Curated annotation (Swiss-Prot), chain A:
Compartments, as annotated in UniProt: Cytoplasm, Cytosol; Cytoplasm; Rough endoplasmic reticulum; Nucleus, Nucleolus
Gene name of the encoded protein: RPS23
SUPFAM superfamilies: Nucleic acid-binding proteins
Organism: Oryctolagus cuniculus
Family (UniProt): Belongs to the universal ribosomal protein uS12 family.
Single GO BP term: translation
GO cellular component terms given for this protein: cytosolic ribosome; nucleolus; rough endoplasmic reticulum; small ribosomal subunit
Region (Disordered): 1-25
Modified residues (N6-acetyllysine): 134
Protein name: Small ribosomal subunit protein uS12
Single GO term (MF): structural constituent of ribosome
Known partners and oligomeric status: Component of the 40S small ribosomal subunit. Part of the small subunit (SSU) processome, composed of more than 70 proteins and the RNA chaperone small nucleolar RNA (snoRNA) U3.
Residues where N6-succinyllysine is found: 53
Curated annotation (Swiss-Prot), chain B:
Native species: Homo sapiens (Human)
GO CC terms: cytoplasm; cytosol; eukaryotic 43S preinitiation complex; eukaryotic 48S preinitiation complex; multi-eIF complex; synapse
Subcellular localization, as worded in the UniProt entry: Cytoplasm
This protein's name: Eukaryotic translation initiation factor 1A, X-chromosomal
Protein function: Component of the 43S pre-initiation complex (43S PIC), which binds to the mRNA cap-proximal region, scans mRNA 5'-untranslated region, and locates the initiation codon. This protein enhances formation of the cap-proximal complex. Together with EIF1, facilitates scanning, start codon recognition, promotion of the assembly of 48S complex at the initiation codon (43S PIC becomes 48S PIC after the start codon is reached), and dissociation of aberrant complexes.
Location (main, coarse): cytoplasm
GO MF: RNA binding; translation factor activity, RNA binding; translation initiation factor activity; tRNA binding
Keywords, ordered alphabetically: Cytoplasm, Host-virus interaction, Initiation factor, Protein biosynthesis, RNA-binding, tRNA-binding
Keyword Nucleotide-binding attached: no
Family per similarity comment: Belongs to the eIF-1A family.
UniProtKB/Swiss-Prot annotation, chain C:
Organism: Oryctolagus cuniculus
The keyword Ribosomal protein appears for this protein: yes
Chief location of this protein within or outside the cell: cytoplasm
Domain of life from the UniProt record: Eukaryota
Protein family according to the UniProt entry: Belongs to the eukaryotic ribosomal protein eS32 family.
GO biological process, one term: translation
One annotated GO molecular function: structural constituent of ribosome
Protein name, per record: Small ribosomal subunit protein eS32
Keyword Transmembrane helix assigned: no
Subunit structure: Component of the small ribosomal subunit.
GO-annotated cellular components: cytoplasm; ribonucleoprotein complex; ribosome
From Swiss-Prot, chain D:
Residues bearing the modification N6-succinyllysine: 49
Subunit structure: Component of the 40S subunit of the ribosome.
Residues of the full protein shown: 77 to 133 of 133
Superkingdom per UniProt: Eukaryota
Location(s) in or outside the cell: Cytoplasm; Nucleus
Protein name (Swiss-Prot/TrEMBL): Small ribosomal subunit protein eS30
Function: Component of the 40S subunit of the ribosome. Contributes to the assembly and function of 40S ribosomal subunits.
Length: 141, 99, 25, 57, 221
RNA sequence: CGGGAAACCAAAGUCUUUGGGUUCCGGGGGGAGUAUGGUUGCAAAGCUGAAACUUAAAGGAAUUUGGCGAAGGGCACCACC
RNA sequence: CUUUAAAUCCUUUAACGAGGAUCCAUUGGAGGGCAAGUCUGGUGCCAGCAGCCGCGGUAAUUCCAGCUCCAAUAGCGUAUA
């Protein structure tokens, strides 16, 4: 504290108000631009339809082909890319199918060596990928 | 040493223009221009030059990106052209290592 | 590049952009 | 080989090893009794470094 | 396995005419033989290794590596120490660190929280240690609270005999050497604090040298 | 004396033993002093001043082998005269 | 039998009701943070794992399976404020 007086409270309150506004994490949650630019719209999960199965590549140190999918949303129609999580689950996803899309867990940031992804696939055709991986549910037709 | 052939999903291609960022575009022998990729075993060990015969892998869900497997030298490319796995009208243009 | 000539380049780009906007009336 | 973009290849070409018919592990209160006995009853005074519970040297 | 004392303090200790190390601490005499303490503090003196941090110095060909071992020693109802030694391999580093930890042990005093009933359990005052950027503060706690801290000052405080304490650290405490030396400085600064509990004017007794110098001149040169 | 991460500082000290009065100002790096709006100027331009997106580093102090088309001393017919 | 507007639920109480007491406890994880195999087979910077460091290049303590072990326990893991 700099202004240390007995009847100095509105100066301290206003100064801390502007210095609280002059931040990054608090300013991200108190402006509508970050929420409107977010394709989820402040939601935890989201639905969408598969357009095509793409393959993106890793970064400089490690070399692999991380296989993803291009999904366009239900609620607004934004076009995102989502990473199919586990091994060999790209057979379970076909084109023009409903998927449930969630984040990675770094609050809208790229995770690991995959560039540009912020989303991952939890369910396809209203059945979970874990049951399909473990041979517990079958894809209806 | 050996003469590896194609497979049910693997084909042949010829490099057209050398590209940056560890990628290239190659002319497949079907009339389709495909953006290939350099294999991670080929990123520093061996080099790929313009207008060379290479073995290329494919994707079964899209045909926009591809990936190079191996590279053929001059004598084995001529031998495989003589066998018939390559078209006769394909110009190999005598790709070789100079001195 | 160093900051001085980058700032000069960005000044020139801003002048060209302002001229194009004022001629795009 | 086949292709570089073959999905799920290592899950599909690995050998299948069947499960083994094992005894039912007791769960609940007596499992804590077994844990307490094996940790703080059958302890032997050793020297140097104590090996782990999964130390399969 | 035989003690040949080089200093006269070691000969005075070995000949069994001193009572405790408390008079040695009262007269602030330097201790340069590590096993005078082993003569005084017996099986109650236990040590635990804190961290082995490898360091490197680059040379003509490659980097010459060395291991620095931290160890803390002390009986559980009194004195506590800390020693650092860096050498080529690990075993002699640990041995040298144990020797330097036995060489430099400091006494502790313990106070009370409010009501002075029974044995003391907590830090008598708000002591503070400072080395590097690590700022370690020790605060008295009520009975039965327990040492609430990071694990390294926790194990150092159970080793030092303090049962109940409140701590609050600040700075880059990830570096274990600065953290351990700062909390050791905080513990060791406990007698160096004047309270009205001991405002009475002290009496000066005779030094051991001037009262056993007849024994020294009769025994050695 | 004392402080600091150190270089250092008689102030950059009297700071976990934390409060003499008071103004301005910074919350990882880039985008970026950028776009738009206002305002000032004949003009060049000044003041105020974001966001989308992207990254796990960008940085400060100091010690030995590193190389100097850096300096000061010595040596070699695998260097020269 | 009791409860209740009448039931159902709980409590009481007849008769049947378990030995590998098949009347079968799952969810994550085992390099560090962070508790817990330098075990055995398969792929060989491919498939994949990985919140962060990082792990895979034809001897993987990190992938895919088996055995053992570890954390909580009718509960456990993931995503967002």
């Amino acid at each position: 504290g700099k202004c240390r007086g007995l009847r100095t409270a509105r100066k301290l309150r206003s100064h801390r108000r502007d210095q609280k506004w002059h931040d990054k994490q608090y300013k991200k949650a108190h402006l509508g631009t970050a929420l409107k630019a977010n394709p989820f719209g402040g939601a935890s999960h989201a639905k969408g339809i598969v357009l095509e199965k793409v393959g993106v590549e890793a970064k400089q140190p490690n070399s692999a082909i991380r296989k993803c999918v291009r999904v366009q949303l239900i609620k607004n129609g934004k076009k995102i890319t989502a990473f199919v999580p586990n091994d060999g689950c790209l057979n379970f996803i076909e084109e023009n199918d409903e998927v449930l899309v969630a984040g990675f867990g770094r609050k809208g940031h790229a995770v690991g060596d995959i560039p540009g992804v912020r989303f991952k696939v939890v369910k396809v055709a209203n059945v979970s990928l874990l049951a399909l991986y473990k041979g517990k549910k079958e894809r209806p037709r | 040493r050996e003469l590896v052939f194609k497979e049910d999903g693997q084909e042949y291609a010829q490099v057209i223009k050398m590209l940056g960022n560890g990628r290239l575009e190659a002319m497949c022998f079907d009339g389709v221009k495909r953006l290939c990729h350099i294999r991670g075993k080929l990123r520093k060990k061996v080099w790929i030059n313009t207008s060379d015969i290479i073995l290329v892998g494919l994707r079964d869900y899209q045909d926009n990106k591809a990936d190079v497997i191996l590279k053929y030298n001059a004598d084995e490319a001529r031998s495989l052209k003589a066998y018939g796995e390559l078209p006769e009208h394909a110009k190999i243009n005598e790709t070789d290592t100079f001195g | 590049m160093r900051a001085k000539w980058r700032k000069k380049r960005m000044r020139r780009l801003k002048r060209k952009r302002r001229k194009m906007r004022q001629r795009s009336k | 080989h086949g292709s570089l973009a073959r999905v799920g290849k290592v899950r599909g070409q690995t050998l299948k090893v069947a499960k083994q018919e094992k005894k039912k592990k007791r769960t609940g209160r007596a499992k804590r009794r077994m844990q307490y006995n094996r940790r703080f009853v059958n302890v032997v005074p050793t020297f140097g470094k104590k090996k782990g519970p999964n130390a399969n040297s | 396995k035989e003690w040949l004392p080089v200093t006269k303090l070691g000969r005075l200790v070995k000949d069994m005419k001193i009572k405790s190390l408390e008079e040695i601490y009262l007269f602030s005499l330097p201790i340069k033989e590590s096993e005078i303490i082993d003569f005084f503090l017996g099986a109650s003196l236990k040590d635990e290794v804190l961290k082995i941090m490898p360091v490197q110095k680059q040379t003509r060909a490659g980097q010459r590596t060395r291991f620095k071992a931290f160890v803390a020693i002390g009986d559980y109802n009194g004195h506590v120490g800390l020693g650092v030694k860096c050498s080529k391999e690990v075993a002699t580093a640990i041995r040298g660190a144990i020797i330097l930890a036995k060489l430099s042990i400091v006494p502790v005093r313990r106070g009370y929280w409010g009501n002075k009933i029974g044995k003391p359990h907590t830090v008598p005052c708000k002591v503070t240690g400072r080395c590097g950027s690590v700022l370690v503060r020790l605060i008295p706690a009520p009975r039965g609270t327990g040492i609430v801290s990071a694990p390294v000052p926790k194990k150092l405080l159970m080793m030092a005999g303090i049962d109940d304490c409140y701590t609050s650290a600040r700075g880059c405490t990830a570096t274990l050497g600065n953290f351990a030396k700062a909390t050791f400085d905080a513990i060791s600064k406990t007698y160096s604090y004047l309270t009205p509990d001991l405002w009475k004017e002290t009496v000066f007794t005779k030094s051991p040298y001037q009262e056993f110098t007849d024994h020294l001149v009769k025994t050695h040169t």
